[PDB]
Amino acid sequence: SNYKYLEVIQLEHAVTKLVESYNKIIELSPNLVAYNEAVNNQDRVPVQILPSLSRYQLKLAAELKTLHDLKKDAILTEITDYENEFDTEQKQPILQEISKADMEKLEKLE
Amino acid sequence: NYKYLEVIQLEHAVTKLVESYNKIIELSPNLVAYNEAVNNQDRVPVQILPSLSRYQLKLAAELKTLHDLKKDAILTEITDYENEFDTEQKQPILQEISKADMEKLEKLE
Amino acid sequence: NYKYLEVIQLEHAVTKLVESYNKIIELSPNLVAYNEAVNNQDRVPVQILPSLSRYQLKLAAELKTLHDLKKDAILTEITDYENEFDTEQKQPILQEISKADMEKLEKLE
Amino acid sequence: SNYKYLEVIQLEHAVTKLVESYNKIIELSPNLVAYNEAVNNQDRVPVQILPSLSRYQLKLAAELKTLHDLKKDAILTEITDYENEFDTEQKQPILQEISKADMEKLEKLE
Amino acid sequence: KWPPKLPEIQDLAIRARVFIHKSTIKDKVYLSGSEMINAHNERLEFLGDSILNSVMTLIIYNKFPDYSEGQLSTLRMNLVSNEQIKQWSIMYNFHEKLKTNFDLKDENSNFQNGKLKLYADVFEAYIGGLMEDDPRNNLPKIRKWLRKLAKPVIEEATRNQVALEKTDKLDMNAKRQLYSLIGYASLRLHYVTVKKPTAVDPNSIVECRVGDGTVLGTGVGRNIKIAGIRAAENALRDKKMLDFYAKQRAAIPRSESVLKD
Amino acid sequence: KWPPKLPEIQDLAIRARVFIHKSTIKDKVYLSGSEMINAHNERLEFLGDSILNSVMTLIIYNKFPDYSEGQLSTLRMNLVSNEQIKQWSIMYNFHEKLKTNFDLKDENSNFQNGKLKLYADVFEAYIGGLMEDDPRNNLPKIRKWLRKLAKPVIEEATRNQVALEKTDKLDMNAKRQLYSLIGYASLRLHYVTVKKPTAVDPNSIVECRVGDGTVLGTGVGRNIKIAGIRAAENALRDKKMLDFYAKQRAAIPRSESVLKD
RNA sequence: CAUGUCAUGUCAUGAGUCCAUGGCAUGGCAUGGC
RNA sequence: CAUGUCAUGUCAUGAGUCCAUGGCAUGGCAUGGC
Ligand SMILES: [Mg+2]
Ligand SMILES: [Mg+2]
Ligand SMILES: [Mg+2]
Ligand SMILES: [Mg+2]
Ligand SMILES: [Mg+2]
Ligand SMILES: [Mg+2]
Ligand SMILES: [Mg+2]
Ligand SMILES: [Mg+2]
């Protein structure tokens, strides 16, 4: 069959962690300006954060915060506010996805 | 600026962010399957029924749907990000306009 | 025949029987009053209301009604009985036919 | 006013004692034949009942039992069975009383 | 014909909830407390309990118009108890239908050796389910359904339980009636309680005795007052005994009989 | 406007019964037990109690869809109690209207120094009266009437009672979240309960401490688990403290930090 | 009908884990309401 | 929500009463159900 129960729980947890992760990024992370300053002068920054500055995460967090200070959060904005807009009965996708492609996906399975 | 406490959380959050999307894309089917279940719920097992009344399963389905198509957009660049990142390369590597980086620099002075 | 235990109860029962009727006739009004109360129960006090749902008050009223008229019949002869009774007089003194006393004598042989 | 509460209780008790009294008479008392036998030969009867035989009650009980062995209990039969025939709503007297005299009693008060 | 036809829950989401035990959802950490509460059946069980007691009360209240509050209460105790509704629940196979996080099977588990109150809860939860689905018209279907279930329980209870033993036909003046016929002050006519009602034996036994210890009667009832009355009624049924003591009193001088010694 | 308009009992015989206390009729010896039971209000009080609890349950169940069973139960406790309904009864002057065999006045009497449960009973009895009179249409009038009475009681209860304090907005992972940021094995990071909830003080206070005794946070709640979480949330709000201990952990060799000593 | 606090068992949770935190079940003790 | 068993107070009940039997209220103790 489809949609095993054990997989549902993993999914629900994953989606929840996904949303919680992005929110904590936006909250804690400064923008690319603050990042670029710290990474350029590392003599000023606290010693403990040096190995962190050499890894991808902090930059990725700074850039996502940057897109957030701007517009074009795009999908990300939709996802965080998704919990609210969800109604027990809605058959509509609610995202930026074209419903025309929803049909082309339908017969593809068939 | 950039406290140590903030930094250990940011590394864990970004890590968990990426793992979460990978697990979703892997596990979740698209809306076709989710719409199949939600429309006639008879055949669907009793244990999964309360999940259909919660947002998580639908959002998972829609993200897998966006993945079955193009327009993952930001989401794809995020997963691949770890491999593209380099220490001495100061480029942002994302889809954001480089000119907008200029104005934000001036703003925070 | 005629146990002592039966005799002390019979004397008490007859005594209480007579006192009871006297108290009723004295205390109870007739049906006119009882029908006044039972028809419109508004003015009638709250405490006496459950009594109107019981047989005792109506029966009391009807017996006083029978007394306001003639036809107490048996009831009058019973009260006056104590005074009319005499030891050596073997007459029944009631309204019953003396011939019926003859047949009952024969029956119990 | 009419129908005092304290008097109602005395009445209800009296009516109850009246009915209970008559029933115990019928139950315990023999007829006038048995009475006439005992009162005539008092040498046979137990010594304890002698003063009782000289008083009105036993004779009165025997005669009421006599009317009961016969018909013409009259009022008495009605009274004992009164409790049964009583319905919460009945405006009828239920006794042998003429309802015509019920009217003549009505305006008498007026 | 038996068991009675189970009232159906139209809403499929609700019908599923009554069978979800909290062990299933409460361990899912990504769920908010609110989302948890709307998931399992605990609210339905809570609601179902009040509904159960409500319509059970109405059933027996009407069926037994002359019953006291102590009798209506004692009877209801048999109908709404966890032990009773557990057995009804098993009867409908709620039972196996229940979704838990642990093994309902495996007799060596502590669960099987407990009171299985879990099986009672799902019955109440089912009732509560009917009330959320369609409150209006599923309510009378609950009465008509619980009437049928209660009938055999009511029948056995009103028969074999002392608390529910009919106290009418009893003579409340029997004790005084007895003293009137026989008793005098120096007779030392009294009542002793040989057995007081307990949980194990909800019976009372009282003996009617005179001064020398002679037992004139014995009685049994839900309590000392009822037993004592039956003891008086027991003595009052024996005429030869009464006539003996009634005569005995007459042979005592009024001088002597009015004292206690 | 206040109090709410009292639902009227049409039947005059029933309206009289709710106000008849058993002391009035039970002392009348000429009455059969059955006749007594149909006289006083005890059956009406019994029935009225189940009705009261039934509609009160339905009221709060709907008004608070996210409330747990423990909260719905605790809230209902405030609505259906004898102490509460006694005060409503006095409000409607049931009170003086009641018919007893003794003095309700005369403060030197033992009655006035008791719990006056008698005044609670007459309220339930009044509800029960409405149900016998006209069961159909007096039932919704009972809901609408008891809704109005409950509103101020519900408002005060949900505010000032710890049991009813909203546990959402709380972070269930807060304790683990804290250990993640700071704690290591040799830190001996733990929680002590300084105050356990009692009847007199239904509050719990828990302190979050490290090995040397330093208190990182304090919390208060309906129980040790809730208090402990708030203590974690209390410590998590202070960034300077966290950043200190987070840095402190980094300065400890992984060799040393993984042990308990 | 719920609550509080423990013991045992079991299943989970978390990011420095030889650590920390919870869910359930069973069994105590205690509280509060009808 | 009722039950059982006592103590005190108070009001009643009964026909040999210097005796006997109950109702209520208050306060204990105990039981049982939700
Ligand atoms: Mg429950
Ligand atoms: Mg229950
Ligand atoms: Mg339950
Ligand atoms: Mg009561
Ligand atoms: Mg109550
Ligand atoms: Mg009550
Ligand atoms: Mg326990
Ligand atoms: Mg007591």
**What secondary structure, in 3-state letters, does chain F show?**
CCCCCCCCCCCHHHHHHCCECHHHHCCCCCCCHHHHHCCCCHHHHHHHHHHHHHHHHHHHHHHCCCCCHHHHHHHHHHHHCHHHHHHHHHHCCHHHHCECCCCCCCCCCCCCCCCCHHHHHHHHHHHHHHHHHCHHHHHHHHHHHHHHHHHHHHHHHHHHCHHHCCCCCCCCCHHHHHHHHCCCHHHCCEEEEEECCCCCCCCEEEEEECCCCCEEEEEEECCHHHHHHHHHHHHHCCHHHHHHHHHHHHCCCHHHHCCCC
Question: Angle, nearest 10°, between helix axes C74-84 and D56-69?
Answer: 150
- Which residue among the candidates F49, F132, F133, F207 is catalytic per the annotation? F49
What is the four-CA torsion angle of A88, A91, A97, A100, rounded to 10 degrees? 180
* Contact list, D54 vs chain C (CB under 8 Å): 87
Tracing tokens 């994302």 back to the chain, one arrives at B94
Spanning CA of A1 to C1' of G29, the rounded length in angstroms is: 50
Determine the angle formed by the axes of helices E135-160 and E117-133, rounding to 10 degrees.
140
* Cβ neighbour number for residue B67 with a 10 Å cutoff: 17
> Taking the domains of chain E in order of start, what are their residue ranges?
1-162, 163-261
Tokens representing E207? 């003996």
Q: Does E199 touch chain A (CB under 8 A)?
A: no
Q: Which of residues 21-60 of E touch strand H (CB under 7 A)?
A: 49, 53
F175 touches strand G (CB under 7 A): yes
Phi, psi of E256 (to 5 degrees): -80, -40
Resolution as reported, in Å: 2.5
Q: By the CB < 8 Å criterion, does F21 face chain C?
A: no
Smallest CA–CA distance from E56 into chain F, residue: F50
User: Is-contact F59 F75, C-beta < 8 A?
Assistant: no
Give burial (CB, 10 Å; 0-12/13-18/19+) of F215.
middle
What would the DSSP string read from start to end of E188-207?
A: T-EEEEEE---SS---EEEE
Between the CA of F44 and the centroid of ligand 4 the distance, in Å, is 8
Check whether the bond before F3 is cis (ω within 30° of 0): yes
For F137, the token pair is: 């249409």
- Distance of alpha carbon E66 from alpha carbon F39, whole angstroms: 11
Gyration radius of chain E's alpha carbons: 28
Total residues belonging to chain F: 261
The CATH number for F163-261, chosen from 3.40.1160.10, 3.40.50.360, 3.30.160.20, 3.30.530.20, is 3.30.160.20
Q: Of the CATH numbers 1.10.1520.10, 3.30.70.20, 3.40.190.10, 3.40.50.1820, which one belongs to the domain with range E1-162?
A: 1.10.1520.10
Burial F151-188 (b: 16+ CB within 10 A, else e): eebbeebbeebbbbeeeeeeeeebbebbeebbbbeebe
Q: F touches which chains (3+ CB pairs under 8 A)?
A: A, B, C, D, E
Give the strand pairing for E215-221 and E190-195.
unpaired
**C 42-71 near F (Cβ less than 8 A):** 42, 46-47, 49-50, 53-54, 56
Say if F and C touch: at least 3 Cβ pairs within 8 Å: yes
DSSP, res C38: H
State yes or no: is F124 an active-site residue.
Answer: yes
Three-state secondary structure call for residue B10: helix
Chain D residue with minimal CA distance to C99?
D70
Q: How many contacts (CB atoms, under 8 Å) link D and F?
A: 8
E31 touches strand G (CB under 7 A): no
Q: Centre a 10 Å sphere on the Cβ of residue C13 and count the other Cβ atoms it contains.
A: 25
Residues 60-79 of chain E within 7 A of strand H, judged by CB, are 68-70, 73-74, 76-77
Contact assessment for residue F18 and residue F126, using Cβ atoms and an 8 Å cutoff: yes
Instruction: Check: CB of residue F40 under 8 Å from CB of residue F25.
Output: yes
Determine, for residues A17 and E30 on separate chains, whether the beta-carbon distance falls below 8 Å. yes
State the Cα torsion E204-E210-E215-E217 to the nearest 10°.
-60
Tell me the pairing of strands F215-221 and F204-209: antiparallel
Joined together, the tokens standing for residue B78 give 């995020």
Residue F208, token pair as written in the block:
């979050």
Residue E111 Cα to ligand 7 midpoint, Å, equals: 13
CB atoms within 10 A of CB D24: 18
Burial pattern C71-102, b for ≥16 Cβ within 10 A else e, equals bbebbeebeebeeeeeeeeeebbbebeeebbe
Cα-to-chain-centroid distance, residue A54: 22
F134 classed as catalytic = no
What are the Cα distances from residue B90, in Å, to A37, A49, B56?
Answer: 11, 18, 37
CA distance linking residue C44 with residue C61, whole number of Å: 16
Q: How many CB atoms lie within 10 A of CB E102?
A: 11
Chain E CB within 8 Å of residue A24 CB: no
Nucleic acid strand H within 7 Å of F26 CB: yes
Best CA proximity match to A95, nearest among B59, B34, B78: B59
- How long is the CA F256 to C1' G17 vector, in angstroms? 14
Q: Taking the mean position of all CA atoms in its chain, how far away is CA E114?
A: 23
- All residues at 6 or more sequence positions from F241 whose CB lies less than 8 Å from its CB, including other chains: F216, F235
Q: Which amino acid is at D107?
A: E
How many other C-beta atoms can be found within 10 angstroms of the C-beta atom of residue F96?
A: 9
Distance CA F110, CA F98 (A): 18
Helix (H) or strand (E) holding E215: strand E215-221
Radius of gyration of chain C (CA): 19
**What is the C-alpha separation between D19 and D79, in angstroms, rounded?**
7
- Strand H proximal residues, C:12-71, Cβ < 7 Å: 12-13, 16
Residue B96 CB contacts under 8 Å (≥ 6 apart), including other chains: A63, A66, A67, A70, A72
How many angstroms from the chain centroid is the CA of residue F53? 13
% helix, strand, coil for chain D, step of 5: 70, 0, 30
Nearest CA in chain B to A83: B55
Using alpha carbons, select from E189, E184, E185, E181 the residue that is nearest to residue E242: E181
Between chains, do C32 and D109 touch, taking CB under 8 Å as contact?
Answer: yes
**What is the amino acid identity at position E160?**
N
Q: Which residue of F has its CA nearest to A46?
A: F247
Residue with tokens 């048995």: D34
Residue E176 Cβ < 7 Å to strand H: yes
Distance CA E12, CA E42 (A): 18
User: Tokens standing for E244?
Assistant: 């003996």
